[PDB]
Design a protein around this ligand. Structure first.
Ligand code: MAN
Ligand code: ZN
Length: 167
């Protein structure tokens, strides 16, 4: 369901959720077939180790079971700089803010990527935290502290967005 959303916002969210679902599905597939270090995995989750890969894999396996199209959206947040927020223990409800709207559907820091970001926040999906914000910061975190990177919402979004595309 939707709360305080316009017609434009509802359709943008439907497509965003559908694009998010596709992001998570391919990311899951990718993780199941790529069992060694690749530029895409290491850029976002740092040095390749099975234990961290299992954690990101589980995150995606759980996120994959999520039905993004059944999520409850709330568009009452007008904070111009914030994309969206969620309560880790209040599953399926995503509150969208101002910045979310000016973002593209897919791509870098997109609406669909934001859903992957927020979704990974749910304790049921793995409960990521907000350690670093942005590609610059996310990549740094992945080279400075892989453990945090695998528990960072943005690093999940960027691995899924994969833009610039890496193999
Ligand atoms: C993460 O590290 C790997 C090397 O193991 C590269 O494939 C990638 O470019 C990134 O630096
Ligand atoms: Zn977050």
């Amino acid at each position: 369901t939707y709360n305080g959303c316009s017609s434009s916002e509802q359709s943008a969210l439907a497509a965003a959720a559908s694009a998010a679902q596709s992001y998570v599905a391919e990311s899951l597939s990718y993780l199941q077939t790529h069992t060694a270090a690749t530029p895409r995995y290491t850029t976002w989750f740092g040095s390749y180790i099975s234990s961290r890969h299992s954690t990101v894999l589980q995150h995606y396996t759980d996120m994959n079971s999520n039905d993004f199209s059944s999520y409850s959206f709330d568009c009452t947040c007008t904070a111009a700089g914030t994309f969206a927020y969620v309560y880790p223990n209040r599953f399926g409800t995503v509150y969208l803010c101002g910045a979310f709207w000016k973002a593209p559907t897919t791509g870098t820091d997109s609406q669909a990527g934001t859903l992957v970001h927020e979704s990974s926040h749910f304790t049921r999906n793995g409960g990521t935290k907000d350690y670093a914000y942005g590609q610059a910061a996310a990549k740094s975190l992945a080279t400075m502290d892989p453990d945090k990177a695998v528990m960072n919402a943005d690093n999940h979004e960027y691995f899924s967005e994969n833009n610039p595309a890496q193999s």
